[PDB]
């Protein structure tokens, strides 16, 4: 819906921290 | 004391900490001042001269 | 770089919660 929105990715600061300890 | 002595009892406060919350009042985060404290003081000392 | 900074520790509210369930 937003006019002018562009494509990118946001670095979630939890999943790499949450998965590194368990895996 | 900053702006507090105009609203009640004066409260002591470091000047570099007062300026950090005056930068916070215009739209720049407090980390700007401390990362450039020496440069800003030189700017202020030179400007007032 | 910060003048006047002191030494302390910050309590992360995630790691004790993240580790207690798995361990
Ligand atoms: C931004 O990215 C999304 C997703 O990568 C793009 O949506 C794709 O559009 C193409 C062509 O319309 C479809 O074939 C894909 O199936 C879409 N992907 C998804 C996940 O829906 C979108 O076109 C991109 N926009 C811009 C301006 O780059
Ligand atoms: C604050 O803590 C840091 C780290 O605990 C101190 O840095 C240490 O300084 C000593 C002496 O210069 C070194 O031998 C250590 O190797 C340093 N540790 C690290 C992790 O770099 C720092 O000196 C402390 N500052 C104050 C004011 O207490």
Q: Mind giving me the DSSP string for B24-42?
A: TTTT--THHHHHTHHHHHH
Residue of C nearest to A17 (CA): C15
Compute the distance between CA of residue B36 and CA of residue C19 in angstroms, rounded to an integer: 39
* Residue whose pair of structure tokens reads 């570099």 in the numeric block: B16
Determine the distance from the C-alpha atom of residue B12 to the mean position of all C-alpha atoms in its chain, rounded to a whole number: 13
C6 alpha carbon, closest ligand? 2
Answer whether C10 touches B (CB < 8 Å). Answer: no
Resolution in angstrom units = 3.5
Contact indicator for B33, B43 with CB cutoff of 8 Å: no
Indicate if the alpha-carbon torsion angle B22, B26, B32, B37 is positive or negative. negative
């Amino acid at each position: 819906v937003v006019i002018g929105i562009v494509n990118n990715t946001v670095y979630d600061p939890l999943q790499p921290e949450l998965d590194s300890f368990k895996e | 004391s900053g702006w507090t002595f105009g609203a009640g009892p004066a409260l002591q406060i470091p000047f570099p900490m007062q300026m950090a919350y005056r930068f916070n009042g215009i739209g720049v985060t407090q980390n700007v001042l401390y990362e450039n404290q020496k440069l800003i003081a030189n700017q202020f000392n030179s400007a007032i001269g």
